DNA sequence: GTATAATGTG
Protein backbone atom coordinates (compact mmCIF):
# COMPACT_ATOMS: atom_id res chain seq x y z
CA UNK A 1 0.00 0.00 0.00
CA UNK A 2 2.73 2.47 0.96
CA UNK A 3 4.75 1.74 -2.19
CA UNK A 4 1.72 2.13 -4.45
CA UNK A 5 0.78 5.44 -2.83
CA UNK A 6 4.34 6.75 -3.16
CA UNK A 7 4.61 5.70 -6.81
CA UNK A 8 1.26 7.32 -7.58
CA UNK A 9 2.44 10.53 -5.90
CA UNK A 10 5.57 10.50 -8.05
CA UNK A 11 3.49 9.92 -11.19
CA UNK A 12 1.10 12.77 -10.32
CA UNK A 13 4.01 15.14 -9.69
CA UNK A 14 5.67 14.11 -12.96
CA UNK A 15 2.52 14.64 -15.03
CA UNK A 16 1.20 17.55 -12.95
CA UNK A 17 -2.36 18.16 -11.79
CA UNK A 18 -4.43 20.65 -9.78
CA UNK A 19 -3.38 20.78 -6.16
CA UNK A 20 -6.65 19.26 -4.92
CA UNK A 21 -5.91 15.75 -6.21
CA UNK A 22 -2.23 15.96 -5.28
CA UNK A 23 -3.14 17.00 -1.73
CA UNK A 24 -5.69 14.19 -1.50
CA UNK A 25 -3.08 11.63 -2.53
CA UNK A 26 -0.54 13.13 -0.12
CA UNK A 27 -3.07 12.64 2.66
CA UNK A 28 -3.46 9.11 1.33
CA UNK A 29 0.27 8.37 1.62
CA UNK A 30 0.38 9.88 5.11
CA UNK A 31 -2.52 7.71 6.26
CA UNK A 32 -0.93 4.64 4.65
CA UNK A 33 2.32 5.19 6.55
CA UNK A 34 0.29 5.77 9.72
CA UNK A 35 -1.47 2.43 9.18
CA UNK A 36 1.86 0.73 8.51
CA UNK A 37 3.48 1.84 11.76
CA UNK A 38 0.38 1.01 13.82
CA UNK A 39 -3.17 -0.16 13.15
CA UNK A 40 -5.86 1.17 15.47
CA UNK A 41 -3.62 3.74 17.14
CA UNK A 42 -5.76 6.19 15.16
CA UNK A 43 -8.89 5.71 13.10
CA UNK A 44 -10.48 2.60 11.68
CA UNK A 45 -8.10 -0.39 11.45
CA UNK A 46 -7.64 -2.02 8.06
CA UNK A 47 -9.11 -5.50 7.52
CA UNK A 48 -8.98 -7.64 4.39
CA UNK A 49 -10.50 -10.96 5.48
CA UNK B 1 33.06 -10.37 20.90
CA UNK B 2 30.52 -10.05 23.72
CA UNK B 3 31.50 -6.77 25.41
CA UNK B 4 28.35 -4.61 25.40
CA UNK B 5 28.91 -1.89 27.99
CA UNK B 6 25.75 0.04 27.14
CA UNK B 7 22.70 -0.03 24.87
CA UNK B 8 21.14 3.24 23.71
CA UNK B 9 18.15 4.26 21.60
CA UNK B 10 17.65 7.34 19.47
CA UNK B 11 15.40 8.95 16.88
CA UNK B 12 16.39 7.93 13.36
CA UNK B 13 16.90 10.68 10.78
CA UNK B 14 16.51 10.47 6.95
CA UNK B 15 20.33 9.88 6.70
CA UNK B 16 20.31 7.06 9.38
CA UNK B 17 17.49 5.14 7.58
CA UNK B 18 19.48 5.31 4.27
CA UNK B 19 22.84 4.33 5.95
CA UNK B 20 21.29 1.11 7.45
CA UNK B 21 19.72 0.19 4.06
CA UNK B 22 21.81 -1.51 1.29
CA UNK B 23 19.32 -0.56 -1.52
CA UNK B 24 16.10 1.44 -2.31
CA UNK B 25 12.68 -0.31 -2.96
CA UNK B 26 11.23 1.19 -6.23
CA UNK B 27 8.31 -1.23 -7.07
CA UNK B 28 5.67 -3.20 -5.02
CA UNK B 29 5.83 -6.61 -6.87
CA UNK B 30 6.65 -9.39 -4.31
CA UNK B 31 7.34 -12.61 -6.37
CA UNK B 32 7.19 -13.69 -10.09
CA UNK B 33 4.32 -16.26 -10.39
CA UNK B 34 5.96 -18.33 -13.24
CA UNK B 35 9.54 -18.68 -11.78
CA UNK B 36 8.48 -18.47 -8.06
CA UNK B 37 11.56 -16.18 -7.51
CA UNK B 38 11.97 -12.50 -6.36
CA UNK B 39 11.50 -9.64 -8.88
CA UNK B 40 13.83 -6.77 -9.74
CA UNK B 41 13.64 -3.93 -7.20
CA UNK B 42 10.62 -5.50 -5.53
CA UNK B 43 9.87 -6.32 -1.91
CA UNK B 44 12.13 -9.41 -2.09
CA UNK B 45 14.81 -8.58 -4.68
CA UNK B 46 18.23 -10.15 -4.22
CA UNK B 47 19.72 -6.88 -5.48
CA UNK B 48 18.38 -5.20 -2.33
CA UNK B 49 18.44 -7.79 0.45
CA UNK C 1 -32.40 -11.62 -0.03
CA UNK C 2 -30.20 -8.54 -0.27
CA UNK C 3 -28.68 -9.78 -3.53
CA UNK C 4 -32.06 -10.99 -4.80
CA UNK C 5 -33.67 -7.58 -4.32
CA UNK C 6 -30.65 -5.84 -5.84
CA UNK C 7 -30.83 -8.08 -8.91
CA UNK C 8 -34.60 -7.72 -9.29
CA UNK C 9 -34.46 -3.92 -9.02
CA UNK C 10 -32.24 -3.89 -12.13
CA UNK C 11 -33.15 -6.93 -14.24
CA UNK C 12 -35.85 -6.72 -16.90
CA UNK C 13 -39.40 -6.95 -15.55
CA UNK C 14 -40.95 -8.64 -18.60
CA UNK C 15 -39.24 -12.04 -18.86
CA UNK C 16 -38.30 -12.36 -15.17
CA UNK C 17 -38.92 -15.69 -13.44
CA UNK C 18 -38.18 -16.66 -9.82
CA UNK C 19 -35.81 -19.42 -10.97
CA UNK C 20 -33.33 -16.90 -12.42
CA UNK C 21 -33.90 -14.64 -9.39
CA UNK C 22 -33.15 -16.83 -6.35
CA UNK C 23 -29.45 -17.31 -5.61
CA UNK C 24 -28.62 -20.41 -3.56
CA UNK C 25 -24.88 -19.91 -3.02
CA UNK C 26 -24.93 -17.68 0.10
CA UNK C 27 -27.32 -19.85 2.13
CA UNK C 28 -25.39 -23.08 1.56
CA UNK C 29 -22.14 -21.20 2.17
CA UNK C 30 -23.42 -19.94 5.53
CA UNK C 31 -24.67 -23.40 6.54
CA UNK C 32 -21.33 -24.99 5.66
CA UNK C 33 -19.37 -22.26 7.45
CA UNK C 34 -21.42 -22.76 10.61
CA UNK C 35 -21.10 -26.54 10.54
CA UNK C 36 -17.36 -26.31 9.90
CA UNK C 37 -15.90 -23.46 11.95
CA UNK C 38 -18.57 -22.52 14.52
CA UNK C 39 -17.41 -23.03 18.10
CA UNK C 40 -20.68 -24.87 18.86
CA UNK C 41 -20.02 -27.66 16.30
CA UNK C 42 -17.46 -29.86 18.04
CA UNK C 43 -16.12 -33.33 17.34
CA UNK C 44 -18.18 -35.90 19.24
CA UNK C 45 -15.68 -37.50 21.61
CA UNK C 46 -16.07 -41.27 21.38
CA UNK C 47 -13.99 -42.78 24.17
CA UNK C 48 -17.08 -44.73 25.25
CA UNK C 49 -20.88 -44.47 25.05
CA UNK D 1 -11.63 9.32 10.43
CA UNK D 2 -13.68 9.48 7.21
CA UNK D 3 -10.83 10.17 4.81
CA UNK D 4 -13.49 10.26 2.08
CA UNK D 5 -15.47 13.12 3.64
CA UNK D 6 -12.71 15.74 3.46
CA UNK D 7 -12.21 14.85 -0.20
CA UNK D 8 -15.99 15.07 -0.68
CA UNK D 9 -15.97 18.62 0.69
CA UNK D 10 -13.01 19.51 -1.53
CA UNK D 11 -14.65 18.14 -4.67
CA UNK D 12 -17.99 19.75 -3.81
CA UNK D 13 -16.35 23.15 -3.40
CA UNK D 14 -16.33 23.59 -7.18
CA UNK D 15 -19.49 23.84 -9.28
CA UNK D 16 -20.56 21.96 -12.40
CA UNK D 17 -20.30 23.06 -16.04
CA UNK D 18 -22.93 23.25 -18.78
CA UNK D 19 -22.76 22.46 -22.49
CA UNK D 20 -21.95 26.06 -23.39
CA UNK D 21 -19.47 26.21 -20.52
CA UNK D 22 -17.91 22.95 -21.65
CA UNK D 23 -17.57 24.29 -25.21
CA UNK D 24 -16.03 27.57 -24.07
CA UNK D 25 -13.59 25.80 -21.75
CA UNK D 26 -12.64 23.41 -24.56
CA UNK D 27 -11.98 26.38 -26.84
CA UNK D 28 -9.90 28.09 -24.15
CA UNK D 29 -7.80 24.98 -23.48
CA UNK D 30 -7.27 24.47 -27.22
CA UNK D 31 -6.15 28.10 -27.49
CA UNK D 32 -3.75 27.62 -24.59
CA UNK D 33 -2.25 24.46 -26.08
CA UNK D 34 -1.85 26.20 -29.44
CA UNK D 35 -0.23 29.14 -27.63
CA UNK D 36 2.28 26.81 -25.97
CA UNK D 37 2.99 25.20 -29.34
CA UNK D 38 3.64 28.67 -30.75
CA UNK D 39 5.90 29.53 -27.80
CA UNK D 40 8.03 26.49 -28.62
CA UNK D 41 7.57 27.29 -32.34
CA UNK D 42 7.72 31.12 -32.45
CA UNK D 43 11.31 31.39 -33.62
CA UNK D 44 10.72 35.12 -34.28
CA UNK D 45 9.56 35.79 -30.73
CA UNK D 46 7.28 38.82 -30.56
CA UNK D 47 7.49 41.40 -27.80
CA UNK D 48 3.97 42.23 -26.58
CA UNK D 49 2.39 39.17 -28.19
CA UNK D 50 4.77 37.11 -26.05
CA UNK D 51 3.31 38.57 -22.84
CA UNK D 52 -0.20 38.08 -24.22
CA UNK D 53 0.71 34.47 -25.05
CA UNK D 54 1.97 33.88 -21.51
CA UNK D 55 -1.28 35.31 -20.14
CA UNK D 56 -3.28 33.04 -22.46
CA UNK D 57 -1.21 30.04 -21.33
CA UNK D 58 -1.99 30.84 -17.70
CA UNK D 59 -5.66 31.24 -18.61
CA UNK D 60 -5.66 27.84 -20.29
CA UNK D 61 -3.98 26.26 -17.28
CA UNK D 62 -6.68 27.72 -15.03
CA UNK D 63 -9.37 26.52 -17.45
CA UNK D 64 -8.09 22.94 -17.51
CA UNK D 65 -7.72 22.92 -13.72
CA UNK D 66 -11.33 24.09 -13.37
CA UNK D 67 -12.52 21.51 -15.90
CA UNK D 68 -10.85 18.66 -14.02
CA UNK D 69 -12.13 19.96 -10.68
CA UNK D 70 -15.68 20.00 -12.04
CA UNK D 71 -15.32 16.58 -13.69
CA UNK D 72 -14.03 14.75 -10.60
CA UNK D 73 -17.68 14.07 -9.70
CA UNK D 74 -18.06 11.75 -12.70
CA UNK D 75 -14.88 9.94 -11.63
CA UNK D 76 -16.36 9.40 -8.16
CA UNK D 77 -19.71 8.30 -9.58
CA UNK D 78 -17.94 5.73 -11.77
CA UNK D 79 -15.52 4.42 -9.12
CA UNK D 80 -18.46 3.94 -6.74
CA UNK D 81 -19.37 0.65 -8.44
CA UNK D 82 -15.99 -1.12 -8.06
CA UNK D 83 -15.81 -1.16 -4.25
CA UNK D 84 -15.32 -4.32 -2.22
CA UNK D 85 -13.00 -5.99 -4.75
CA UNK D 86 -9.73 -5.95 -2.82
CA UNK D 87 -9.07 -2.23 -3.35
CA UNK D 88 -10.19 0.65 -1.10
CA UNK D 89 -12.72 3.00 -2.66
CA UNK D 90 -10.25 5.86 -2.29
CA UNK D 91 -7.57 4.08 -4.31
CA UNK D 92 -10.11 3.49 -7.09
CA UNK D 93 -11.03 7.18 -6.94
CA UNK D 94 -7.39 8.16 -7.42
CA UNK D 95 -7.05 5.73 -10.34
CA UNK D 96 -10.16 7.26 -11.88
CA UNK D 97 -8.67 10.73 -11.44
CA UNK D 98 -5.60 9.58 -13.37
CA UNK D 99 -7.88 8.18 -16.07
CA UNK D 100 -9.76 11.48 -16.22
CA UNK D 101 -6.50 13.38 -16.71
CA UNK D 102 -5.60 10.93 -19.48
CA UNK D 103 -8.97 11.55 -21.14
CA UNK D 104 -8.63 15.33 -20.85
CA UNK D 105 -5.19 15.36 -22.46
CA UNK D 106 -6.78 13.83 -25.59
CA UNK D 107 -10.19 15.55 -25.61
CA UNK D 108 -11.59 16.86 -28.90
CA UNK D 109 -14.47 19.35 -29.07
CA UNK D 110 -15.02 19.57 -32.84
CA UNK D 111 -17.05 16.35 -32.95
CA UNK D 112 -19.60 18.00 -30.66
CA UNK D 113 -19.83 15.02 -28.30
CA UNK D 114 -20.10 15.72 -24.58
CA UNK D 115 -16.91 15.37 -22.57
CA UNK D 116 -18.59 13.08 -20.03
CA UNK D 117 -19.11 10.32 -22.60
CA UNK D 118 -15.46 10.44 -23.68
CA UNK D 119 -14.19 10.55 -20.10
CA UNK D 120 -16.33 7.67 -18.80
CA UNK D 121 -14.66 5.06 -21.01
CA UNK D 122 -11.17 6.23 -20.06
CA UNK D 123 -12.02 6.35 -16.34
CA UNK D 124 -13.45 2.83 -16.44
CA UNK D 125 -10.43 1.52 -18.35
CA UNK D 126 -8.00 3.12 -15.91
CA UNK D 127 -9.90 1.83 -12.87
CA UNK D 128 -10.09 -1.74 -14.17
CA UNK D 129 -6.43 -1.71 -15.24
CA UNK D 130 -5.33 -0.47 -11.82
CA UNK D 131 -7.48 -3.04 -10.04
CA UNK D 132 -6.03 -5.83 -12.19
CA UNK D 133 -2.45 -4.60 -11.70
CA UNK D 134 -2.63 -3.88 -7.94
CA UNK D 135 -5.43 -5.89 -6.29
CA UNK D 136 -3.45 -9.14 -6.01
CA UNK D 137 -0.35 -9.34 -3.82
CA UNK D 138 0.98 -12.10 -6.10
CA UNK D 139 0.40 -9.94 -9.16
CA UNK D 140 -0.70 -12.11 -12.08
CA UNK D 141 -0.34 -10.97 -15.70
CA UNK D 142 -3.24 -8.89 -16.97
CA UNK D 143 -4.22 -11.50 -19.57
CA UNK D 144 -4.35 -14.20 -16.89
CA UNK D 145 -6.45 -11.87 -14.72
CA UNK D 146 -8.88 -11.45 -17.62
CA UNK D 147 -9.01 -15.23 -18.07
CA UNK D 148 -9.71 -15.67 -14.34
CA UNK D 149 -12.52 -13.11 -14.49
CA UNK D 150 -14.01 -14.87 -17.52
CA UNK D 151 -13.84 -18.23 -15.74
CA UNK D 152 -15.51 -16.80 -12.63
CA UNK D 153 -18.27 -15.21 -14.71
CA UNK D 154 -18.91 -18.50 -16.52
CA UNK D 155 -18.91 -20.38 -13.21
CA UNK D 156 -21.47 -18.05 -11.65
CA UNK D 157 -23.65 -18.18 -14.77
CA UNK D 158 -23.62 -21.99 -14.73
CA UNK D 159 -24.34 -22.06 -10.99
CA UNK D 160 -27.35 -19.79 -11.50
CA UNK D 161 -28.67 -21.69 -14.52
CA UNK D 162 -28.20 -25.26 -13.27
CA UNK D 163 -28.94 -24.45 -9.62
CA UNK D 164 -25.81 -26.27 -8.43
CA UNK D 165 -22.04 -26.02 -8.64
CA UNK D 166 -21.03 -27.09 -12.14
CA UNK D 167 -18.46 -29.86 -12.46
CA UNK D 168 -15.06 -29.38 -14.09
CA UNK D 169 -16.22 -31.23 -17.21
CA UNK D 170 -19.39 -29.12 -17.49
CA UNK D 171 -17.42 -25.91 -16.93
CA UNK D 172 -14.94 -26.89 -19.64
CA UNK D 173 -17.76 -27.79 -22.03
CA UNK D 174 -19.50 -24.44 -21.51
CA UNK D 175 -16.34 -22.30 -21.60
CA UNK D 176 -14.34 -24.51 -23.96
CA UNK D 177 -11.31 -24.08 -21.69
CA UNK D 178 -8.95 -27.03 -21.06
CA UNK D 179 -9.52 -28.78 -17.75
CA UNK D 180 -5.83 -28.38 -16.90
CA UNK D 181 -6.01 -24.69 -17.82
CA UNK D 182 -9.17 -24.35 -15.72
CA UNK D 183 -7.36 -25.87 -12.73
CA UNK D 184 -4.34 -23.60 -13.27
CA UNK D 185 -6.54 -20.50 -13.43
CA UNK D 186 -8.50 -21.53 -10.33
CA UNK D 187 -5.35 -22.24 -8.32
CA UNK D 188 -3.67 -18.98 -9.38
CA UNK D 189 -6.84 -17.13 -8.29
CA UNK D 190 -6.97 -17.48 -4.51
CA UNK D 191 -6.61 -15.23 -1.48
CA UNK D 192 -3.42 -16.13 0.44
CA UNK D 193 -3.58 -16.98 4.07
CA UNK D 194 -1.86 -14.45 6.31
CA UNK D 195 0.70 -16.20 8.48
CA UNK D 196 -0.43 -13.99 11.37
CA UNK D 197 -3.95 -15.40 11.71
CA UNK D 198 -4.37 -17.37 14.95
CA UNK D 199 -4.59 -21.15 14.68
CA UNK D 200 -6.49 -23.25 17.19
CA UNK D 201 -8.73 -20.22 17.93
CA UNK D 202 -7.22 -19.74 21.41
CA UNK D 203 -4.50 -17.39 20.08
CA UNK D 204 -1.84 -19.62 21.63
CA UNK D 205 0.19 -19.23 18.42
CA UNK D 206 -0.20 -17.72 14.95
CA UNK D 207 0.20 -19.90 11.89
CA UNK D 208 3.58 -18.42 11.01
CA UNK D 209 4.91 -20.10 14.14
CA UNK D 210 4.47 -23.68 12.94
CA UNK D 211 6.34 -23.45 9.61
CA UNK D 212 9.51 -25.48 9.24
CA UNK D 213 12.60 -24.53 7.23
CA UNK D 214 13.99 -26.21 4.11
CA UNK D 215 17.72 -25.70 4.75
CA UNK D 216 20.48 -27.84 6.20
CA UNK D 217 19.33 -29.23 9.53
CA UNK D 218 21.48 -29.17 12.65
CA UNK D 219 22.52 -32.75 11.78
CA UNK D 220 21.16 -33.69 8.34
CA UNK D 221 23.86 -31.96 6.27
CA UNK D 222 26.19 -30.39 8.85
CA UNK D 223 27.45 -33.54 10.56
CA UNK D 224 27.33 -35.77 7.48
CA UNK D 225 28.79 -33.12 5.18
CA UNK D 226 31.72 -32.39 7.49
CA UNK D 227 32.26 -36.09 8.25
CA UNK D 228 32.32 -37.06 4.57
CA UNK D 229 34.65 -34.13 3.88
CA UNK D 230 37.07 -35.48 6.50
CA UNK D 231 36.63 -39.01 5.15
CA UNK D 232 37.35 -37.50 1.72
CA UNK D 233 40.60 -36.05 3.04
CA UNK D 234 41.30 -39.58 4.31
CA UNK D 235 40.26 -41.69 1.29
CA UNK D 236 40.58 -39.50 -1.81
CA UNK D 237 44.03 -38.63 -0.46
CA UNK D 238 44.97 -42.32 -0.66
CA UNK D 239 44.75 -42.03 -4.45
CA UNK D 240 48.11 -41.58 -6.16
CA UNK D 241 49.35 -38.01 -6.53
CA UNK D 242 48.90 -38.12 -10.30
CA UNK D 243 45.53 -39.82 -9.80
CA UNK D 244 44.73 -37.28 -7.07
CA UNK D 245 45.28 -34.45 -9.55
CA UNK D 246 43.29 -36.41 -12.15
CA UNK D 247 40.33 -36.49 -9.78
CA UNK D 248 40.87 -32.88 -8.67
CA UNK D 249 40.67 -31.64 -12.28
CA UNK D 250 38.56 -34.06 -14.34
CA UNK D 251 36.14 -34.57 -11.43
CA UNK D 252 36.64 -31.30 -9.56
CA UNK D 253 37.89 -31.65 -5.98
CA UNK D 254 40.34 -28.75 -5.77
CA UNK D 255 39.51 -26.41 -8.66
CA UNK D 256 36.13 -27.91 -9.53
CA UNK D 257 35.13 -27.52 -13.16
CA UNK D 258 35.27 -31.23 -14.10
CA UNK D 259 37.81 -31.13 -16.93
CA UNK D 260 36.51 -33.39 -19.69
CA UNK D 261 39.00 -36.01 -20.84
CA UNK D 262 39.90 -33.59 -23.64
CA UNK D 263 40.42 -30.69 -21.22
CA UNK D 264 42.48 -32.65 -18.69
CA UNK D 265 44.38 -34.15 -21.61
CA UNK D 266 45.21 -30.65 -22.82
CA UNK D 267 46.40 -29.82 -19.30
CA UNK D 268 48.49 -33.02 -19.07
CA UNK D 269 49.01 -33.78 -22.78
CA UNK D 270 47.32 -37.20 -22.57
CA UNK D 271 44.63 -38.49 -24.92
CA UNK D 272 40.99 -39.26 -24.18
CA UNK D 273 41.46 -43.03 -24.41
CA UNK D 274 44.45 -43.54 -22.10
CA UNK D 275 42.83 -41.78 -19.13
CA UNK D 276 39.85 -44.15 -19.25
CA UNK D 277 41.97 -47.18 -18.37
CA UNK D 278 43.49 -45.41 -15.36
CA UNK D 279 40.02 -44.25 -14.30
CA UNK D 280 38.68 -47.81 -14.44
CA UNK D 281 41.72 -49.04 -12.50
CA UNK D 282 41.00 -46.43 -9.83
CA UNK D 283 37.38 -47.61 -9.73
CA UNK D 284 38.52 -51.20 -9.24
CA UNK D 285 40.95 -50.15 -6.51
CA UNK D 286 38.35 -48.14 -4.58
CA UNK D 287 35.49 -50.66 -4.71
CA UNK D 288 37.48 -53.28 -2.75
CA UNK D 289 38.41 -53.12 0.92
CA UNK D 290 38.25 -50.44 3.60
CA UNK D 291 37.69 -47.71 1.00
CA UNK D 292 34.39 -49.17 -0.22
CA UNK D 293 33.38 -49.96 3.36
CA UNK D 294 33.86 -46.31 4.32
CA UNK D 295 32.09 -44.99 1.23
CA UNK D 296 29.04 -47.28 1.41
CA UNK D 297 27.43 -45.19 4.15
CA UNK D 298 27.56 -42.05 1.98
CA UNK D 299 25.93 -43.80 -1.01
CA UNK D 300 22.75 -44.56 0.96
CA UNK E 1 0.88 36.89 -0.82
CA UNK E 2 4.24 38.58 -0.31
CA UNK E 3 5.10 38.28 3.41
CA UNK E 4 3.37 35.30 5.06
CA UNK E 5 3.92 31.82 3.63
CA UNK E 6 1.42 29.15 4.63
CA UNK E 7 0.81 25.57 3.62
CA UNK E 8 -1.06 22.47 4.76
CA UNK E 9 0.44 19.04 5.37
CA UNK E 10 3.38 17.37 7.05
CA UNK E 11 5.77 19.45 4.94
CA UNK E 12 4.41 22.58 6.60
CA UNK E 13 5.07 21.09 10.04
CA UNK E 14 8.59 20.10 8.99
CA UNK E 15 9.35 23.62 7.78
CA UNK E 16 7.83 25.23 10.88
CA UNK E 17 9.71 22.96 13.31
CA UNK E 18 12.98 23.47 11.42
CA UNK E 19 12.51 27.24 11.59
CA UNK E 20 11.38 27.00 15.22
CA UNK E 21 14.31 27.25 17.63
CA UNK E 22 14.23 25.13 20.78
CA UNK E 23 16.55 27.38 22.80
CA UNK E 24 14.44 30.54 22.50
CA UNK E 25 11.12 28.93 23.42
CA UNK E 26 12.88 26.96 26.17
CA UNK E 27 14.19 30.19 27.70
CA UNK E 28 10.79 31.86 27.39
CA UNK E 29 9.05 28.89 29.03
CA UNK E 30 11.64 28.81 31.81
CA UNK E 31 10.87 32.48 32.44
CA UNK E 32 7.13 31.73 32.43
CA UNK E 33 7.59 28.84 34.87
CA UNK E 34 9.54 31.25 37.07
CA UNK E 35 6.15 32.93 37.58
CA UNK E 36 3.05 31.40 39.18
CA UNK E 37 -0.34 30.87 37.51
CA UNK E 38 -0.95 27.40 38.89
CA UNK E 39 -3.80 26.79 36.45
CA UNK E 40 -1.43 27.27 33.51
CA UNK E 41 1.58 26.06 35.50
CA UNK E 42 0.86 22.34 34.99
CA UNK E 43 0.69 22.71 31.21
CA UNK E 44 3.77 24.93 31.29
CA UNK E 45 5.64 22.28 33.29
CA UNK E 46 4.69 19.50 30.87
CA UNK E 47 5.77 21.55 27.86
CA UNK E 48 8.94 22.53 29.74
CA UNK E 49 9.93 18.94 30.48
CA UNK F 1 4.85 12.06 10.34
CA UNK F 2 5.53 9.34 12.88
CA UNK F 3 2.23 8.11 14.30
CA UNK F 4 3.60 7.58 17.81
CA UNK F 5 4.24 11.31 18.35
CA UNK F 6 1.30 13.32 16.98
CA UNK F 7 -1.21 10.73 18.25
CA UNK F 8 0.32 9.62 21.55
CA UNK F 9 -0.96 10.93 24.88
CA UNK F 10 0.72 13.35 25.47
CA UNK F 11 1.32 14.19 21.79
CA UNK F 12 5.01 15.10 21.74
CA UNK F 13 4.66 17.12 18.54
CA UNK F 14 1.79 19.08 20.06
CA UNK F 15 3.80 19.86 23.19
CA UNK F 16 6.99 20.89 21.39
CA UNK F 17 5.11 22.84 18.70
CA UNK F 18 2.56 24.45 21.07
CA UNK F 19 -0.41 23.30 18.99
CA UNK F 20 -3.71 21.84 20.11
CA UNK F 21 -4.30 18.16 19.24
CA UNK F 22 -7.27 19.08 17.04
CA UNK F 23 -5.18 21.61 15.13
CA UNK F 24 -2.34 19.11 14.73
CA UNK F 25 -4.63 16.40 13.35
CA UNK F 26 -6.34 18.90 11.03
CA UNK F 27 -3.00 20.09 9.67
CA UNK F 28 -1.58 16.59 9.28
CA UNK F 29 -4.48 15.18 7.23
CA UNK F 30 -4.75 18.32 5.05
CA UNK F 31 -7.78 19.96 6.65
CA UNK F 32 -6.79 23.63 6.96
CA UNK F 33 -3.91 25.90 6.03
CA UNK F 34 -1.37 27.23 8.52
CA UNK F 35 0.97 30.23 8.44
CA UNK F 36 4.45 28.69 8.69
CA UNK F 37 6.57 31.85 8.62
CA UNK F 38 5.99 35.55 7.97
CA UNK F 39 8.50 38.29 7.21
CA UNK F 40 7.83 39.90 10.59
CA UNK F 41 10.93 42.11 10.38
CA UNK F 42 9.87 43.60 7.04
CA UNK F 43 6.31 43.84 8.38
CA UNK F 44 7.69 45.90 11.27
CA UNK F 45 9.99 48.16 9.25
CA UNK F 46 7.10 48.64 6.80
CA UNK F 47 4.40 49.02 9.48
CA UNK F 48 4.09 52.69 8.53
CA UNK F 49 3.97 51.91 4.82
C1' DG G 1 -6.83 2.74 -28.01
C1' DT G 2 -12.18 3.87 -27.63
C1' DA G 3 -17.32 8.86 -29.52
C1' DT G 4 -25.29 7.96 -27.07
C1' DA G 5 -24.83 8.74 -22.37
C1' DA G 6 -22.90 8.59 -17.96
C1' DT G 7 -20.96 14.19 -13.31
C1' DG G 8 -20.36 13.30 -4.46
C1' DT G 9 -20.42 6.42 -0.17
C1' DG G 10 -20.48 3.16 2.83
PDB file of N, CA and C in Angstrom, chain B residues 21-27 29-30 38-39 41-49:
ATOM      1  N   UNK B  21      20.194   0.894   5.280  1.00  0.00           N
ATOM      2  CA  UNK B  21      19.724   0.194   4.058  1.00  0.00           C
ATOM      3  C   UNK B  21      20.847  -0.046   3.055  1.00  0.00           C
ATOM      4  N   UNK B  22      20.820  -1.181   2.350  1.00  0.00           N
ATOM      5  CA  UNK B  22      21.806  -1.511   1.291  1.00  0.00           C
ATOM      6  C   UNK B  22      21.265  -1.083  -0.080  1.00  0.00           C
ATOM      7  N   UNK B  23      19.943  -0.931  -0.234  1.00  0.00           N
ATOM      8  CA  UNK B  23      19.319  -0.561  -1.522  1.00  0.00           C
ATOM      9  C   UNK B  23      17.938   0.052  -1.356  1.00  0.00           C
ATOM     10  N   UNK B  24      17.411   0.735  -2.379  1.00  0.00           N
ATOM     11  CA  UNK B  24      16.100   1.443  -2.311  1.00  0.00           C
ATOM     12  C   UNK B  24      15.005   0.617  -3.004  1.00  0.00           C
ATOM     13  N   UNK B  25      13.826   0.455  -2.383  1.00  0.00           N
ATOM     14  CA  UNK B  25      12.677  -0.314  -2.958  1.00  0.00           C
ATOM     15  C   UNK B  25      11.903   0.605  -3.910  1.00  0.00           C
ATOM     16  N   UNK B  26      11.892   0.324  -5.223  1.00  0.00           N
ATOM     17  CA  UNK B  26      11.232   1.191  -6.235  1.00  0.00           C
ATOM     18  C   UNK B  26       9.848   0.673  -6.633  1.00  0.00           C
ATOM     19  N   UNK B  27       9.583  -0.638  -6.564  1.00  0.00           N
ATOM     20  CA  UNK B  27       8.311  -1.229  -7.069  1.00  0.00           C
ATOM     21  C   UNK B  27       7.678  -2.157  -6.027  1.00  0.00           C
ATOM     22  N   UNK B  29       5.981  -5.176  -6.488  1.00  0.00           N
ATOM     23  CA  UNK B  29       5.825  -6.606  -6.874  1.00  0.00           C
ATOM     24  C   UNK B  29       6.603  -7.462  -5.875  1.00  0.00           C
ATOM     25  N   UNK B  30       6.023  -8.555  -5.367  1.00  0.00           N
ATOM     26  CA  UNK B  30       6.650  -9.393  -4.305  1.00  0.00           C
ATOM     27  C   UNK B  30       7.379 -10.598  -4.912  1.00  0.00           C
ATOM     28  N   UNK B  38      12.165 -13.944  -6.549  1.00  0.00           N
ATOM     29  CA  UNK B  38      11.973 -12.504  -6.357  1.00  0.00           C
ATOM     30  C   UNK B  38      12.152 -11.650  -7.618  1.00  0.00           C
ATOM     31  N   UNK B  39      11.465 -10.504  -7.714  1.00  0.00           N
ATOM     32  CA  UNK B  39      11.499  -9.637  -8.882  1.00  0.00           C
ATOM     33  C   UNK B  39      12.477  -8.485  -8.672  1.00  0.00           C
ATOM     34  N   UNK B  41      14.007  -5.113  -7.978  1.00  0.00           N
ATOM     35  CA  UNK B  41      13.638  -3.928  -7.202  1.00  0.00           C
ATOM     36  C   UNK B  41      12.222  -4.052  -6.642  1.00  0.00           C
ATOM     37  N   UNK B  42      11.881  -5.249  -6.183  1.00  0.00           N
ATOM     38  CA  UNK B  42      10.616  -5.499  -5.528  1.00  0.00           C
ATOM     39  C   UNK B  42      10.753  -5.477  -4.022  1.00  0.00           C
ATOM     40  N   UNK B  43       9.831  -6.170  -3.360  1.00  0.00           N
ATOM     41  CA  UNK B  43       9.870  -6.324  -1.914  1.00  0.00           C
ATOM     42  C   UNK B  43      10.711  -7.515  -1.477  1.00  0.00           C
ATOM     43  N   UNK B  44      11.314  -8.244  -2.422  1.00  0.00           N
ATOM     44  CA  UNK B  44      12.127  -9.406  -2.090  1.00  0.00           C
ATOM     45  C   UNK B  44      13.403  -9.488  -2.921  1.00  0.00           C
ATOM     46  N   UNK B  45      13.737  -8.459  -3.696  1.00  0.00           N
ATOM     47  CA  UNK B  45      14.808  -8.583  -4.675  1.00  0.00           C
ATOM     48  C   UNK B  45      16.128  -8.954  -4.013  1.00  0.00           C
ATOM     49  N   UNK B  46      16.878  -9.836  -4.677  1.00  0.00           N
ATOM     50  CA  UNK B  46      18.226 -10.154  -4.225  1.00  0.00           C
ATOM     51  C   UNK B  46      19.142  -8.943  -4.331  1.00  0.00           C
ATOM     52  N   UNK B  47      18.920  -8.091  -5.333  1.00  0.00           N
ATOM     53  CA  UNK B  47      19.723  -6.883  -5.480  1.00  0.00           C
ATOM     54  C   UNK B  47      19.683  -6.031  -4.221  1.00  0.00           C
ATOM     55  N   UNK B  48      18.570  -6.063  -3.490  1.00  0.00           N
ATOM     56  CA  UNK B  48      18.375  -5.198  -2.333  1.00  0.00           C
ATOM     57  C   UNK B  48      18.820  -5.918  -1.068  1.00  0.00           C
ATOM     58  N   UNK B  49      18.233  -7.086  -0.804  1.00  0.00           N
ATOM     59  CA  UNK B  49      18.442  -7.795   0.454  1.00  0.00           C
ATOM     60  C   UNK B  49      19.551  -8.838   0.359  1.00  0.00           C
TER      61      UNK B  49
END
